[PDB]
């Protein structure tokens, strides 16, 4: 199959060469004056040479599925995978996951209390008897909690004196509560009517800056249930606000450069730290949040729908809910929650050491035959239909025995996957044959490994003073080659490559022909430095995730992808995280061709065939006008403005998108026949 020889001194050093490397233990396999490194070839070659089949030591990777009894864990099996992983060779173990039933639920209503959330507070202050009613079907005795939030106390997030601070309410001043940021009004409780009545109590507040500081509330919530309390099963949250959201970095405005610690420190179910404390970074949730098995459910105005949409991409288990400004269709959010929240099966793992690389496969239930990618994104599975993930773990070197875990994001089920460095190849010891190797050496699967001072295939020679006539036979690759390719003095048939005390430098091989320094460079580093790849006799063996002549095309990834998740938009192969845009399309993702004519001609005919109805000319339209979209919105960019079929100047912008002649227009509701 494949096997390039690294320094081969024992059967183990043959294994550390690659997956397709096998070793022969059969004695008397070495000819009159043949190398010991010949014992290490490919299984096929060994048989062609004569090496018996049962003499081919071949440590291969496999899996130990120690399945539990039951109620060990529920729908993630197996529960304990003890893999024996040989470097370079991939071990594959499957993962059966058949979600079963709805466990105890635990909701929490994060509502922004502003003057814009007035009729929201009215049409919601006490509609919770239909929440348990909407909870009745699937889950049983769940829990219900509430938490309010506005924005940081101190400016510039809201005027900090004066007694508008005691009275922020704009114009009505209906005794609204003091400006706050997070008030834990209700704890997770069984009752439902007590919950409603404790809510209506509190009235709104107000702040200055338009977007909110709701992110600070997020952490403070799932930070210390030593005072808030939380169920040990499920934990769903729901964001609600007709306003933006502030993240880290914005605190510098309020003269606060103390980052977010992660733990909440309240004394009266109310924050008094958010002031002496900076905003939680955007990414400080997908970690902490997803660590406590909590998952918000975005539900805001249509004005803020596609901003939280981009937020759905990043953080896991999160849905987008466009609703009216009255919060009346808020309970239908959760009919859309379990819809695609019980659907996102995840299968990531604890941050593994760099010495390892993990991947997965996917076999969704409705049709999908995925292969080779992290995660386990199958947005088409729900109640009681199992799934299939093929976890393939590979190593680069002979790891040290350790252990990691593969969890499902948003699930308490831990799968303790044990990992064992499988390399050594037991065979014999130095009780059998202290004879051969002339007493000054031991034996290991045939060959003999001599002492510091003895060398030779039978420890017959010593590392001082030796040489013969035709022992220099297999000591040179061919008749017209210099002995040991220089940089190596031949002793007893074979060669002993000289040593260089220079970083990296190392000679090796039967005739000392290969080195670990003379390969293809990259960024002023050998085979891409020790990070990217390595050097071995000219060719670079790039680490996992890196390909190319010298790991030049450093990443096998595709940063050539945009949010559209189509490579290089229109045209351009994705080589080395770079697009090769056809024509004059420019970088990085090939969308704008600055020099292009920005053609509006030939488009007028179809512009009046879509917005206005002034006759699809050549034929009809939607056929001669595959600029299929005509959004009812202020799209922009290619601001065009030409005339119509008969006189009038028809205005319209023209936002191109992705491939070939695909477009998106808004034709101004106006004309000009002057």
């Amino acid at each position: 199959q494949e096997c390039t020889k690294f320094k081969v001194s024992s059967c183990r050093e043959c294994i550390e060469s690659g997956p397709g490397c096998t070793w022969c233990q059969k004695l008397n396999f070495t000819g009159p004056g043949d190398p010991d490194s010949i014992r290490c070839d490919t299984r096929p070659q060994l048989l062609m040479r004569g090496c018996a089949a049962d003499d081919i030591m071949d440590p291969t990777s496999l899996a130990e599925t120690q399945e539990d009894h039951n109620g060990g864990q529920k729908q993630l099996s197996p529960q304990k995978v003890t893999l024996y992983l040989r470097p370079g060779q991939a071990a594959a173990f499957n993962v059966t996951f058949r979600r079963a039933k709805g466990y105890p639920i635990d909701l929490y209503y994060l509502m922004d209390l502003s003057y814009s959330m007035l009729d929201d507070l009215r049409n919601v202050k006490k509609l919770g008897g239909d929440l348990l009613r909407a909870l009745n079907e699937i889950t049983e005795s769940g829990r219900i909690g509430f938490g309010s939030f506005v924005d940081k106390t101190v400016l510039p997030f809201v005027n900090t004196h004066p007694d508008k601070l005691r009275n922020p309410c704009p114009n009505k001043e209906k005794e609204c509560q003091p400006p706050f940021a997070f008030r834990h009004v209700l704890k997770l409780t069984n009752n439902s009517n007590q919950f409603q009545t404790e809510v209506g109590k509190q009235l709104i507040s107000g702040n200055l800056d338009a977007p909110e500081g709701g992110l600070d509330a997020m952490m403070q919530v799932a930070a210390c249930p030593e005072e808030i309390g939380w169920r040990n099963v499920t934990r769903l949250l729901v964001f609600a606000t007709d306003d933006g959201f502030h993240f880290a970095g914005d605190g510098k405005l309020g003269a606060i450069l103390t980052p977010n610690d992660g733990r909440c420190h309240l004394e009266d179910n109310l924050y008094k730290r958010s002031n002496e404390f900076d905003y939680p970074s955007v990414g400080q949730l997908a970690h902490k949040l997803a660590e406590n098995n909590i998952q918000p459910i975005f539900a805001v105005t249509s004005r803020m729908v596609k901003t939280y949409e981009k937020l759905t991409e990043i953080i896991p288990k999160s849905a987008v809910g466009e609703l009216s400004e009255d919060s009346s269709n808020v309970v239908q959010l959760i009919k859309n929650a379990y819809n695609k929240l019980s659907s996102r099966v995840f299968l990531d793992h604890n941050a593994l050491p760099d010495t390892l690389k993990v991947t997965y496969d996917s076999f969704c239930s409705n049709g999908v035959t995925h292969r080779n990618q992290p995660r386990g994104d199958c947005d088409g599975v729900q109640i009681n239909v199992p799934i299939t993930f093929q976890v393939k773990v590979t190593a680069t070197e002979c790891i040290q025995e350790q252990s990691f875990v593969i969890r499902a994001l948003g699930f308490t089920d831990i799968v303790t996957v044990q990992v064992l460095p499988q390399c050594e190849c037991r065979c014999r010891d130095q009780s059998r044959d202290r004879s051969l190797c002339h007493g000054k050496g031991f034996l290991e699967c045939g060959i003999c490994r001599c002492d510091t001072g003895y060398i030779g295939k039978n420890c017959e020679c010593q590392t001082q003073g030796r040489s013969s006539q035709e022992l220099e036979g297999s000591c040179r690759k061919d008749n017209n080659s210099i002995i040991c390719s220089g940089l190596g003095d031949c002793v007893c048939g074979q060669c002993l490559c000289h040593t260089s005390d220079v970083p990296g430098k190392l000679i090796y091989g039967q005739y000392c022909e290969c080195d670990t320094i003379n390969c293809e460079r990259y960024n002023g580093q050998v085979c891409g430095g020790p990070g990217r790849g390595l050097c071995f006799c000219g060719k670079c063996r790039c680490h996992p995730g890196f390909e190319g002549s010298a790991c030049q095309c450093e990443r096998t990834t595709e940063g050539c992808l945009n949010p559209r998740r189509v490579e290089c938009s229109g045209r351009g192969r994705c080589r080395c995280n770079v697009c090769e845009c056809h024509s004059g399309y420019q970088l990085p993702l090939c969308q704008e061709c600055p020099g292009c004519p920005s053609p509006c001609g030939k488009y007028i005919s179809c512009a009046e065939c879509l917005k206005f109805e002034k006759g699809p000319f050549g034929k009809n339209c939607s056929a001669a006008c595959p600029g299929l979209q005509l959004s009812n919105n202020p799209v922009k960019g290619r601001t065009c403005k030409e005339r119509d079929s008969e006189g009038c100047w028809v205005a319209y912008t023209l936002e191109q998108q992705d491939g070939m002649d695909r477009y998106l227009i808004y034709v101004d509701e106006s004309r000009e026949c002057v």
Partner: protein, 1082 residues
């Protein structure tokens, strides 16, 4: 890689938020910031200047005005060098405008001059609200004379509670007629307005409610009477009955009033109103909602009990159209949040401009300042803090500013602005990569080289990730030619440590290692367990940085106990006055200074006086002696790259340890030095910028086994001692690429037989397979197919060297999986500078095997060539070929060839959209002049100035019938250039049918007109544009007997096909077109 981590200075002044923001001041000092250094009543912080001489920080004197409150100065800092000045800021000034205070910002300019204080210190006064209230009163006969003086007494009352000129009043009374007692003009002018209130008398009479209302808003609310134009219109009414005899109706009056936007209140008296026939005239009268703008009463006397209530409803007035939204201007813009200088005055940044869009205020030389937002026509950019960070971008031409917008669409975009003469528009921009990434936090214009023209720009995004949340900095060069610009000339540096906040800050450090390639520093106070961290990168060639950093001085460097360090940092100035630049990095509590240790590197030459071995002490013999032969080996050492350290002390003297060793890798020493008798030796000797050559004695034993393999001699060398006169160098060192292991070979006179004399005969020849034209830009790699002979004795360590211009070097091919009639070959190549000025040799000895008999062999050697390859209009290259046994004789066998070289250029041309497509039906006669205008814009994104000549093709004559006459070409915004003119006649085919196919009128039909506008030197980036016009005749339109015809002009740019070409393969962007239409019917 030369940032001191031992002997540095540390200022630990414990003053709260001390060491939170820092900057390099006039070289002698460093200024630190402590925003939270409480002073007085919740006021400022304070600054500190620190000198190197004595490790101590002295407070800095400041005249903090009582006006500026809780501004916590020092938070934002900035310093210039032109003339040395410094700038600090309190971006949190608090000025109490009553109801609610805001944030304005206040800065100070210090230096060896006058202590200026610039916004400039017009203590930013609160906002003035404009109200134009109009009292309307029923004076019908139903009201008693007693209830009258009481009501007009309540009127004056509600007038005093207000203050002018920010408020205004106008009164009218309405019964059966309508008297305007005093207008808006007679209120702001009359020093005593209430003097006219007690002057009015009752009217009695009938009642026409609605009628007066119109007589009020269509007169008193005119800008003519004095009612301010841009104002808030309020109207109040006080009546005791409905409208009877009122010849009008509310169905006409109410609408047109709400048009001008007039909030309507109502105050009734009688309680006859609480009937269902007199309650609707309070709702109709007032403006929606009805339950807010009304306050009915029974008694005129206790009408002043609600005098206490009306206080509020009117003051709370802000704006009622878009459901009471929240707009702004410059109340909480905290100007000076981030500042940076520039040849034409400093530049502070505002954040809360309007919809918190953002911007920056520029201050010229005592001329009033300007300001740059994004205009309002820019719908987006709401809440982005445009100007959170600010940086300059000087260029050979005009300056350019840059503002950071962390939260554009909540992701983060960065926008670059230019200030063209009477323009100040936007150059370009780039969105962020991820939501919350915060793309825009930090920015730094840096200079890969030292040409003085800012080449590229860094960007910060500490809170970004995909799997690991280390942070993210983004390199983004500064392409010229607006509307195109990419933060992706590839790369973006990071680190393998989540929650690190990498990119929090950064500054240009400049040339530290002396390879002409500026180097930058970058902070990351979140690394490790909250511990601090900093990074060091280097440039390469033009727009680029090296992802792999050389150093990573973090908070584990016996920084006993600081939590997050690197928050901010600025360097580039020599303050310790030990020659080279210094770096200042702020940290919580204290701030450190890391100097840069001098990096010199050295070149070496090795040789063996006796070239090879004469076979005298070769195979030897055993009667009598070892006459141990005496080989001499001379090595020399000299340092050449110096520019930074300059002549004189240190750049010269520097002792060194030498460690020579022969045949190291083998346990069979082939020789020994005489001085020590060992197989190796060491001696410490003095170096200089002038060579130091010493030859040593070597002893070869008469008899030896291996002779084929030359004997190696390598040296390990370093820099021992490091005492040099004063301690003003302290520690010098070597660079990254330190090939401290240099080896030279000594061959042997191989036995080519008991006779036959060993004739060295080798030839050589090479070519370039498929190499077409070779222009600099394309054809980066250069594939050379070299063949070689051996028509003589066997060459063992045969070597093959090339001569080439500086613009290229050899890179290993490493091709394989299985292909060739070709290379197979492990060979060792070493580049090196040779000739006087320019050329140099890359030798390549076929390392480890023999080249025998009349055998030929072919291998492939490839040379990367730089896109900016300085080389003549022709490039030659040669190939010396010889054996290991050197060249014992006369005429060399070199092989050379010379190639024509060209150079890449990007040259594009567009048809500006100011183009006259004008067809329309009014075509009664054959007139002349509706001159059309074909504007063509052109520009080159190449990288070299190159002459050009822009050609044109404008139709005119058409069978004697002119198409459009007197056509010339204007060249505005540029000198009067010379253009040529020539007429030509097309092929003359049947044009009848020709354009019937296509209404087009290209030059192939009508006698066209070529314009050859030459150009002296089309400097890169130059968008040299120009247009052409001419009265367009309608006569020829009939000549062809159709309608809706269209005439086209072609414009093609040209340049010397030789020397220059265009790069990508083939782009026709150098040939634009403009099609005008002459559809005129009837």
């Amino acid at each position: 890689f030369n940032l001191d981590t031992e002997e540095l200075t540390a200022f630990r002044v414990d003053s709260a938020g001390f060491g939170d923001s820092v900057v390099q001041y006039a070289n002698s000092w460093v200024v630190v910031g402590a925003p939270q250094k409480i002073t007085a009543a919740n006021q400022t912080g304070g600054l500190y200047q620190c000198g190197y001489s004595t490790g101590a920080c002295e407070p800095i004197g400041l005249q903090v005005p009582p006006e500026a409150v809780n501004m916590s100065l020092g938070l934002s800092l900035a310093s210039t060098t032109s003339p040395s000045q410094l700038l600090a800021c309190g971006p949190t000034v608090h000025h109490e405008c009553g109801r609610n205070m805001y944030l304005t910002g206040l800065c100070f300019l210090l230096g060896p001059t006058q202590l200026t204080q610039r916004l400039p210190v017009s203590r930013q006064e609160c906002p003035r609200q404009e109200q134009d209230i109009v009292f309307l009163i029923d004076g019908s006969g139903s009201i008693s004379s007693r209830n009258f003086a009481t009501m007009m007494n309540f009127v004056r009352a509600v007038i005093s509670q207000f203050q002018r000129p920010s408020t205004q009043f106008s009164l009218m009374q309405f019964s059966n007629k309508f008297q305007t007692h005093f207008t808006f003009e007679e209120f702001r002018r009359s020093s005593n307005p209430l003097s006219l209130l007690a002057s009015v008398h009752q009217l009695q009479g009938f009642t026409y409610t609605a009628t007066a209302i119109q007589n009020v808003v269509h007169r008193l609310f005119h800008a003519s009477y004095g009612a301010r134009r841009d104002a808030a219109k309020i109207l109040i009414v006080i009546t005791d009955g409905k409208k009877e005899g009122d010849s009008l109706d509310y169905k006409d009056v109410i609408p047109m009033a709400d048009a001008a936007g007039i909030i309507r209140y109502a105050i009734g008296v009688g309680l006859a109103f609480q009937n269902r026939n007199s309650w609707k005239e309070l709702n109709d009268i007032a403006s929606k909602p009805s339950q807010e703008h009304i306050f009915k009463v029974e008694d005129f006397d206790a009408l002043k009990d609600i005098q206490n209530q009306l206080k509020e409803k009117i003051f709370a007035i802000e704006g009622t159209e878009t459901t009471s939204s929240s707009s702004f201007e410059l109340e909480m813009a905290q100007e000076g949040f981030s500042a940076v200088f520039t040849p034409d005055g400093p530049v502070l940044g505002a954040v809360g401009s309007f919809t918190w869009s953002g911007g920056a205020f520029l201050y010229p030389p005592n001329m009033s300042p300007t300001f740059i937002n994004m205009s309002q026509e820019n719908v987006d950019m709401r809440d982005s803090y445009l100007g959170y960070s600010t940086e300059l971008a000087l260029w050979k031409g005009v300056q350019s500013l840059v503002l950071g917008a962390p939260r554009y669409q909540h992701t983060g975009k960065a926008v670059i602005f230019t200030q063209v003469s009477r323009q100040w528009r936007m150059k370009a921009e780039v969105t962020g990569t991820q939501i919350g990434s915060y793309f825009g936090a930090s920015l730094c214009s840096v200079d890969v080289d030292s040409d003085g023209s800012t080449d590229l720009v860094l960007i910060g995004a500490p809170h970004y990730y995909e799997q690991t949340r280390g942070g993210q900095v983004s390199v983004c060069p500064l392409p010229r030619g607006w509307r195109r610009w990419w933060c992706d000339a590839v790369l973006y540096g990071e680190q393998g440590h989540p929650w690190g906040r990498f990119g929090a800050a950064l500054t240009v450090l400049g040339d530290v290692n002396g390879d002409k390639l500026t180097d930058v520093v970058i902070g990351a106070p979140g690394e490790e367990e909250n511990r601090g961290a900093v990074y060091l990168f280097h440039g390469v060639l033009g727009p680029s940085i090296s992802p792999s950093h050389s150093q990573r001085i973090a908070g584990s460097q016996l920084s006993s106990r600081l939590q997050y360090f690197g928050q901010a940092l600025s360097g580039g100035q020599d303050l310790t006055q030990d020659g080279l630049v210094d770096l200042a990095v702020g940290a919580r509590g204290q701030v450190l200074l890391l100097r840069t240790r001098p990096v010199l590197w050295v070149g070496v030459s090795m040789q063996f006086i006796p070239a090879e071995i004469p076979r005298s002490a070769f195979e030897c013999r055993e009667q009598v002696v070892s006459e141990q032969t005496l080989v001499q080996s001379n090595i020399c050492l000299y340092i050449d790259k110096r520019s930074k350290n300059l002549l004189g002390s240190r750049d010269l003297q520097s002792s060194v340890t030498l460690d020579l060793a022969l045949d190291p890798g083998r346990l069979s020493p082939r020789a020994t030095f005489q001085e020590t008798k060992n197989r190796s030796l060491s001696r410490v000797r003095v170096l200089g910028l002038k060579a130091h050559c010493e030859n040593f004695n070597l002893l070869l034993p008469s008899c030896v086994e291996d002779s084929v393999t030359p004997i190696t001699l390598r040296l390990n060398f370093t820099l021992v001692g490091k005492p040099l006169l004063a301690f003003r160098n302290l520690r010098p060192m070597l660079a990254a690429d330190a090939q401290r292991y240099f080896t030279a070979s000594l061959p042997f006179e191989k036995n080519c037989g008991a006779d036959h004399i060993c004739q060295d005969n080798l030839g050589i020849s090479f070519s370039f397979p498929g190499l077409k034209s070779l222009l600099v830009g394309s054809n980066l790699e250069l594939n050379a197919e070299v063949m070689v002979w051996n028509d003589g004795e066997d060459s063992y360590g045969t070597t093959i060297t090339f001569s080439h211009p500086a613009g290229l070097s050899y890179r290993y091919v490493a091709e394989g999986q299985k292909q060739g009639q070709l290379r197979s070959l492990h060979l060792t190549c070493d580049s090196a500078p040779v000739g006087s000025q320019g050329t140099w040799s890359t030798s390549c000895r076929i390392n480890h095997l023999i080249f025998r008999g009349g055998a030929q062999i072919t291998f492939l050697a490839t040379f990367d060539v730089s896109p900016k390859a300085v080389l003549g209009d022709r490039l030659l290259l040669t190939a010396n070929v010889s054996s290991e046994n050197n060249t014992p004789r006369t005429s060399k066998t070199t092989f050379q060839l010379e190639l024509p070289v060209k150079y890449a250029v990007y040259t594009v041309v567009s048809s500006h959209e100011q183009f006259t497509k004008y067809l329309n039906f009014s075509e009664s006669e054959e007139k002349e002049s509706h001159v059309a205008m074909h504007r063509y814009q052109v520009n080159n994104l190449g990288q070299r100035d190159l002459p050009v000549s822009i050609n044109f093709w404008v139709p005119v004559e058409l069978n004697q019938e002119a198409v459009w006459m007197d056509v010339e070409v204007s060249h505005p915004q540029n000198p009067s250039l010379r253009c040529s003119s020539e007429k030509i006649a097309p092929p003359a085919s049947d044009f009848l049918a020709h354009i019937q196919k296509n209404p087009v009128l290209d030059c192939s039909i009508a006698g066209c007109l070529r314009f050859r506008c030459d150009v002296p030197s089309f400097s890169v980036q130059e968008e040299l544009d120009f247009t052409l016009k001419g009265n367009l005749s309608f006569g020829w339109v009939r000549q062809i007997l159709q309608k809706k015809v269209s005439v086209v002009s072609v414009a093609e740019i040209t340049f010397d096909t030789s020397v220059y070409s265009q790069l990508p393969g083939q782009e026709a962007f150098m040939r634009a077109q403009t099609t005008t239409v002459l559809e005129k019917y009837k």
